[PDB]
Structure formats: structure tokens, C-alpha cells
RNA sequence: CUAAGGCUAAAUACCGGCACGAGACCGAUAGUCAACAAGUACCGUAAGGGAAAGUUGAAAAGAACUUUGAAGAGAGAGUUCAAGAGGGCGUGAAACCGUUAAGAGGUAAACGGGUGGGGUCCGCGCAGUCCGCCCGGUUCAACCCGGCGGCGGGUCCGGCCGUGUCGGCGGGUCCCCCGACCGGCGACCGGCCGCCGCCGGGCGCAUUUCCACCGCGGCGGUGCGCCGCGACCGGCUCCGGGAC
RNA sequence: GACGUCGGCUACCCACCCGACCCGUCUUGAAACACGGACCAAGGAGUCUAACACGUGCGCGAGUCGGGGGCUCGCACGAAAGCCGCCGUGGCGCAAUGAAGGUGAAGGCCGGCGCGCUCGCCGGCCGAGGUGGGAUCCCGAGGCCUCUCCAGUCCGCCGAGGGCGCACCACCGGCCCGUCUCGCCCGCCGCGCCGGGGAGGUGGAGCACGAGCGCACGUGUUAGGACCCGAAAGAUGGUGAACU
RNA sequence: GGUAUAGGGGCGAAAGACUAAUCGAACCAUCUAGUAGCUGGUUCCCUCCGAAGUUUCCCUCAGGAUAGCUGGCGCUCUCGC
RNA sequence: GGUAAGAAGCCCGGCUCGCUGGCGUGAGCCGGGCGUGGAAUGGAGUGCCUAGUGGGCCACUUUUGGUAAGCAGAACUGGCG
RNA sequence: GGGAGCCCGCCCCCGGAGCCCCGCGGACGCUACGCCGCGACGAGUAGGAGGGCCGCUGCGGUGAGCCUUGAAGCCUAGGGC
């Protein structure tokens, strides 16, 4: 006879990756041991990000990684990205880097190796710095997907700039009553 | 896979997951897009604004080939040419300024988006934007019009 | 087989654009990694005195 | 009935489409038949090219492309006259000839 | 571009017709209506409507013959591995019925929880005191010799192998040489050492290993069934005292 | 206690005490004098295609793709599988905004030339802005010590405090297109009812160093027969005056 | 007995009477698995969470849309370290 | 029934303003100094896919129509559903 | 490392110190989708989700699988989970 609301007693956070691939599970075991032994929170963050789904770890662009490493203070530090590193074609000068990532695109890998940089996997990063010392943790833009453009306040509402679900943009598919001031109203 | 589908977990449930106060009738709300103005106006005005009503001028025999004009930004311009072309640039103590044919790469108009590296280049394209031309002139190139 | 699939530093030369997939982790043997001096140098003493 | 921001779509399935559904289970057999017919024709014309008559250089209308060069229907009469080839003899020699093509440039 | 004239195969379609191949398809209330004398029997004046219906047995070897009965039906006998397969006959369930055995029966029957009584067999036993280790009361380990095999190791010992850099430019990406450092990485070998195992020789009996017993001596889970008692703890309902 | 004695929680029958109204459904309300219901066996109802939206898994990644076709085989396995200057004609995305003519995403600092005129023109430099909150990473005074006093490089834990600050949120600015207002100058093959530029508001599904493409799976919404069964009706073409 | 009139037609001393046991629109086949906001039914187990008959609009009142109530998927952080 | 019970707060110093003004305002920019801001309990925030429901009823208290109703219709809270 | 203390020297290695911690190697516990230890909670229609070493059918692999010394199927007052 106790009044406790069991509505949110079960936490929905992930515990193991849903992927059935074996290399990711081996990395999960390694970082589980590292997080439960070492006092560093870097291992815990890396394990949590490894648990995340594909959409929750967007790819990181080479230009974004370059601009994040160019910040003063993180000189000679290894970049740790749980997603994938993708080449950026609109950048010419690429300094040498120390990048740790699950995957790297072929073009980005060629660019980094030609620039004189070094690319490491997560097991190599664990062997080098078990507690993640001298590491810069980076991630891609979470809201970069076009899916989030359709989220938020619904269209046809004042002060809303949400992209509606339209079969094909055009003159006679929208921008009519509800959007034109000359036809009914607008928001 | 019906094995993984939901219908296997609904075996034994009387309503089959569709309520018992109001049964899963055939078409209660109307078929398709019925009632765009009546009894679905709230949804049609809060999720598809501008659905009803005409706007603009009619064009009977429209051809996409006449208005076909792909665009490329100065953000990605040297990607159209080989990397060794840019390697043989800002060098040789001559001011080579190689020629990049946009039409050959597959674009007609060159737009001014992005930063252009400090390297002269001859850009040949059907159409140019004012800002793109200004960027090219500031870099030290020349815009060339082609038909 | 090498001319069909190629190595990691050479194209297939029989498939127009194909290379072998990259490994997500190289040192697959985690048993060797866990008991390495580098990792064990930065580990706390495990607690197995369950109460 | 619409439900919480779904795309407004109009499927074109109001006719008796199930009666006019066209399956493609005969695609591999059709490909095999075409391959056999092509091989039979090639064996029929033993020294003649498998592809067939020569096709001229042709540019494209519709300025969308405006640059691509493709094979033409046949060689023009003025082109044959300049090359010194009779139009009827060209058909027997294996030169595609069409009498509708113009020559502006 | 040249209408009011005309011809022409090819790539195209084919739930009808002839002959074939195939199946992640159904297996006789399923699959075509039709697996069988199926558009058959049958119904309606007619346009039309339209079923049900597979399985004895390897082989009919389909029960000769005697006997009761008019016969249908039996009782013997016989074939078959099997008629406990006997011509709508493989397997033969449920509803329902007849008979045998047991139990019970005035609040319709039936159901849940808790026991008790009687049967069905099941597992014991002609005591079941279940064992498994250590200790007490026929040959070899111990120790050497020879052979074989295996593991680990460094002077990286010598040669291969192999990653990063430097070098001969020697033949943007791809190949060889010696020299050096580093990671010498389970990527391999030849000698060396240490250890282990096996075989063959010595080692003849205070060692060695078997088989059995008298010790319930030490340890561990257990007792065939019915039980009883003791001490400690935890949670409770109480009782008798003394003192502020 | 051991040849008619043991154990069988469960299941066979019976007896006792307590409880106990027949299932499904509509309903605020069912045991209902509400509806379906004798019993049993077999069949039986959320499927498939297409278009979407979201989430998840995989591959590639500012790219992605196999649709169609072709090259290998006589098809057992195969109508599979491999490959393509077809590797991309073409779809999606990489650019949006206007009805359209059309336009179309970057700035800042420093020196100079015009009157620095919040304006224009010449060179160099930095090159996606700023504030607040920001997981993590860096420096880190100092402390904790060590069998005695001092000196003391090392392996450490804590570490006040000080910073670079991922992703993300709030805001301030900046840029692109349409539109309104005030205004001053630029260019010429054609000096015009030419074209371009500024500042200040506003509208956009926009830019502000990217995240998409293909396949598979799950849920939801639809068009289709559309979870299964059910009408009173409508249309087309044929057959009936053997009854009346 | 023969014959003529056949279905929005025939015929009717008129009853909406007869038209093959059916007539205020005969019978057979097809469209057709016509539509239903209305009945009825909707098939194995366990575990966890767990509602509403309320807002506004609709020729809306036995129904839908929209908010509300609900479930699932997560994600960003703080810490009896 | 709204508020306030502090770091998103106070105290200084200096810049910008095409707004407003005699000097002044007012707002925005930068640099520096000051921390438990009443009691008690809780770990919080955020984004999408989203079934069913949109016939209710009863009870303490207030109350509308009705003579009254196991009548019809409202307000808070709690129940059955 | 130097100076020394309530005459000098050792103050040693687990192939063995023998253990309530041994940092030299480490389960009976390690199907790490596994095992182990603490707390709190357990109602439920419509509805959602998760786990089924629950069940039926056919296909690709796999049990040197079962089987005329007896398969599927059916019956059972037997032993069971």
C-alpha cells in the first residue's frame, strides 16, 4: 500500500548495441572493461557513444575536424570520433592529424596519410592511452539530417518555419490559401 | 516476415488491437483525401497550408530542357579538374593560371558560394554570378563566357 | 584471387573500382590487449570481496 | 483519414489495375532469346559486323545536352555526294543512309 | 514538312490450341467445379444451376470343407507376418451407445482451496545403513644411461620473416640491395640452456602400485520410511520479579 | 521397522468444511426475464502490391544506386551468380527564392587613393562571427606520504584555481531570393523607358565547412476486395403466356 | 388445342390484380468479393507500462479531425566514486 | 489565484548609439570584486513514431429547472468504469 | 644520496612467504548475449512494448541424427519437468 507511480521507473537508455557485428561487440567489451576499471570518464563516454545508433553518431567532416583541431590548446592531441570521418572536397590545406575513428572514407584516409597524419582504431587508442589522455572528443552535427527540418512547430502556424511534407515542390502544390495573404490568410 | 510481424502477438485478443468500444469499421472518416474542407479542415490547415487555391501563370507546353541549367559553386571548383592541375599552380614562376571548363564538367552557371583559394584560374561557363565574378577577379582570374 | 580482389594498397585491376574492406579493429585478440602492461598500468584494484 | 502530419498523396489505383498487372517473370527468358537471336544473326552474316551498318556522327538538340555526340540514323545525301559514294551503293556496302537529314553547319 | 493514294518483317502481346520442362505452391472439407464412368448424376419449361465420391493386401493367396438356420447371419477349419487388413476392407480419434470392473448417490449437475479413505500401477527391500578421498593395522616410480617428442627463454647467437624511417632514383600509385635504429610483432628455422612427457635398460624391495578385511580414525555430500531430543540465532504473543 | 509393510507433492473414484450464479459481446450497468450457443471432428478471419512518415541494422559516402541492356551456358544445381569507357544516360542529394521575366548564399582586420562621407576604388593579412550554459581534454599552485634529519630526481591519488572549449539550446549579429521606403554614385559596342551597387523593415520549406544514396526489418496512414460475413438498390445481355 | 401481346414491358369488367408456388416492377448470368458512419465474430503463453468518454471544427449528434490522456524509441546532463 | 525568497544577483571602470535629451537619459557592449539566499521532499531536461478514447455513472459539499423522482443539467475532489 | 639514532656486517629469492593478501602466474565463477552482490516494487479493460529452450508447415546448412530388433499417427487408472 504505497503510492509510487511506475510510469517512468524503467530507464530506456541503451545497455548493449543492437548491431550483431562482432568487431563492434569486441570493442564494446574492451571499453566496458576500461570504463568499469579506470576512473576516467572518457572511457564511459566512448562506451555510451558506441552504444548509440547510426543516426545518433552522424559522420564527421574533415573540414569540421580540422577547424576543431585548429583551436588553441589542443596541439599534438589525438582526435577521437565514434562515428565516421568523411572527406571534404572544399578544403585544400590539410595539416597532419592523429585521428581515431571506427571508419574513415577512402578519400579522407588518403588525404590524412598524404598529409603525414596518423589514423588509429579504438583498440590502438586503448593501447596508446587507456584513460584517453591527450584526446579531443569530437562528433558530427546531430541535427544535420534533413529529417529534423520537418520537426518542431507544425506549418500553418504563426512564427513557424518547418518544412512541410510535400510530394513535390512547385507552383501549384502549395503557396496558396493559408500561405498567401491574397488567398484567405497566411501564417 | 509474418513471424516478426505484430499479428502473431494479437492471437487470442478479441479486438485484435483495434479497440472494442469502437470497432475497426471499413471507412469511418472517408476514402482517401475526403473532406479537405469539411471535418478534416483542421488537419489540412495545420499540416498542409496552401493546399487549396490556385496561384501563378499556366504554362501549357513546358520543357525542362529549355530551363535546364545546373549550377556549381566556387566552394567546389578545383574538384572539377585533376589535383595535379592545382599542384602545377602557384609554381613555375610563370603565372600559368590553368583553364577549368565548367561546361565540360557538366555545369552551365557558376555561383559564388564558398571561399576560393589564392590561385589564378580561367573559368569558362555560359553564365556567371556577380559575386562569383568578383571572387574570381579578387583571386586573380578571368571569367570567360561560352555559348 | 589477388588479381580478382586486390590487396589493401592496390586496386583489384579486374573489378573497375573495388578494394578490400577496412578493419574496424586491427588487434582482434582482446585477451592480449587486456593484460598488456599499458592497460594494467592504469587500472584500479578489482573488488571481489562481495558482501 | 489524415493522421498527425502525413504526406498528402493520391495513389492511382482506382481502376482495375489487378487485371492489367504486367509481370516480369519472363525477363531472363526474353534476354536469353534476344541473345540467341543476336548470335544467330551474327552467324548468318559471317564477315559482316555484328552491330550492323555504320552510323554517322550526330549532335543533340534540346540545349539541355547540347554537347553530347551520339550515333545518327544515317549518313546524309550531301555527305555521300561529297565523299563520292552513291546512295544506293552505300546501302549494299553497309552505310546507313537516311534522306531526311539536313546539313546546316 | 508536303496531307486528302498504297506495301512492308525486327525488337511487341498471348489465362485459347498442340507438345514439353520447373516449383521454398495444396495434398482429398486443401488444390481447377471435376485426382474416381465431371460439366457426370441430378434440378428447372428455359436461359442456366451443379455435386458427393481415392486407399484390403507384397501377392486374391478374396475364407476350400464340416455344422445351425429358409436366408440374411453365425460356430469351427484355412490363407496371410497381420482379417486385431474379410470386397466402401490402411491408420480408426471425439461427440454417442452397449457390456465388464470399482466407487458413489434425498438440496440439478459441475468447479476452486485443504485433507482423509479406497484402487491403478511406479521405486524400493528378504537392512537401503549411499559412497568418494587421506591415514593406521604383481612391479616400479625415487636416481642414473640411450633415443624420441613437446614447452619457454635470451646473448637476437646465425639465417629467413616481417612493420615505420633513413639511403641507391637503383624499376601520382605499385617493385629490389646492403648498412643502421626502432616495434622483434605467436611470421618461420639451425644450434644452446632449463623443464616436462613417452619408450627401452639398469634400480629386487623399510620405496612402488594393485585386490580384500578390522578401524565409523580425519573430510564431504547423505540418511529407505516414521520420529524424538539438545544448544545458538532471528521475528512475535506473554509471565514472574526487583529498582528509580 | 521390515515379505503384505513402506514413499508416490502430481493424476482415478468417493466423503467432509469453506468458497463458489454461464460463457462471448453491446453497455455507466449482465447470472440476467438482453442477444449467439445440443455435442463432436475438419476449415475459418489484419494478407499482398504500390506510395509515404518515423525508428533500427548493413554497405558506400558528397556522393550513392543497379532500373533497363550487353558479355559469360547447352538452365541439374540456374531462370541463380560474376562483370560492364554501359559506373551513369537517369533517380535522390550537393541551392534556394519569386507568378514570372530572373536572380542566386562571406565576411573581417590593416596600409593607401577620393572629404573615411558608416560611401566608392587600390594591396596585404586572418579566414565560417559573438555571448551564456556546455559532456570530455590541458595547465595546475599545493597537499597526502615513505622506519630518523636534510637534499632529491621519479611512480602516483586528490587537487583549489586557471583555459581550449565537441554535439546541443537560448539570443545577438552576417549572407541569398521576393517585396516596401529614403537616397548617393558607377560601366559601356550600341549613352537608353540600359545594366549594377547602399542603408533601413519585412516574407521564404533557405546559406552560415555537408549527410546523403541503396537494401532489409518494425510501427502508423492511405489506394486497391483490403481483417472476415451481411443488405434495401443500379446497369448490361438473354429465357419464360405448360399457371394466370 | 393452336395462336398474338415479354419486363419500366405485356395484360387487366381495375383488386396494384396476373405475368410458371415471387409481382408497388418476373427469372438466369455478369459488372460483384457493389457500399455501409450499422450488427456479429476476430485463434498461444508469460512479463512490464497502462487510459477516455474532455477542448474546438465538420448538414456534426451511433462518426471523423484536432489538442488531451497512453506506450515505445532514444538522446543531453548531475551523482555515495 | 498571480508573484519574489539571489550567480540568469549585486558593486565599480571604460566604450557604442543614425533613438531621446541643455548638460542628461535609456539600451547594448567589454574588464575586474563579491557565493550555500525561507521549511520539507525529490535526479532533472529534451526530440520524434504513436494504438485506443471522444455514449459515462455514482458519492461529501455548492447549486439550476421541477412538487418530487433510482429525473434532467453544472463546480471541486474521490471512486466504479 | 649525504648525515645519523632510541663495534661492524646482513635486513636475502615465493619453482616456494605459505596464505584474510602476495602488484611473479592466476576460478570450482569466464555459453562476458555469461556469472555474482545489494536495495525498492509487483492490481488492471481498451491499448502499447519485450521475452518465448511455446506450437504448425515448407526451404538453405548442420546432428558420421532416429528408423522393419519398428517412423508418423492414435489411446492410456503409469513416471515426470
From Swiss-Prot, chain B:
Key word Acetylation present: yes
Keyword list, A-Z: Acetylation, Cytoplasm, Hydroxylation, Phosphoprotein, Ribonucleoprotein, Ribosomal protein
Keyword Translocase: no
Region (Disordered): 1-36
GO process annotations (BP): translation
Compositionally biased intervals (Basic residues): 1-29
Compartments where located: Cytoplasm
Superkingdom to which the source organism belongs: Eukaryota
Residue ranges crossing the lipid bilayer per the database entry: none
Processing and modification events after translation: Hydroxylated on His-38 by MINA.
PROSITE patterns: RIBOSOMAL_L15
InterPro entries registered for this protein in UniProt: Rbsml_uL15_N, Ribosomal_uL15, Ribosomal_uL15/eL18, Ribosomal_uL15/eL18_sf, Ribosomal_uL15_CS
A Pfam family per the record: Ribosomal_L27A
Subunit structure: Component of the large ribosomal subunit.
Function: Component of the large ribosomal subunit. The ribosome is a large ribonucleoprotein complex responsible for the synthesis of proteins in the cell.
Protein name as it appears in the record: Large ribosomal subunit protein uL15
Species this protein is from: Oryctolagus cuniculus
Phylogenetic placement of the source organism: Eukaryota, Metazoa, Chordata, Craniata, Vertebrata
Gene this chain is encoded by: RPL27A
From Swiss-Prot, chain C:
Citrulline modifications at: 41
Modified residue annotations for Phosphoserine: 31, 36
Post-translational modification: Citrullinated by PADI4.
Disulfide bonds: none
Superkingdom of origin: Eukaryota
Localisation per UniProt entry: Cytoplasm
Modification type Phosphothreonine: residues: 7
Family listed: Belongs to the universal ribosomal protein uL4 family.
Subunit structure: Component of the large ribosomal subunit. May bind IPO9 with low affinity. Interacts with RBM3.
Role, per record: Component of the large ribosomal subunit. The ribosome is a large ribonucleoprotein complex responsible for the synthesis of proteins in the cell.
Record's protein name: Large ribosomal subunit protein uL4
Source organism (scientific name): Oryctolagus cuniculus
Lineage, top ranks: Eukaryota, Metazoa, Chordata, Craniata, Vertebrata
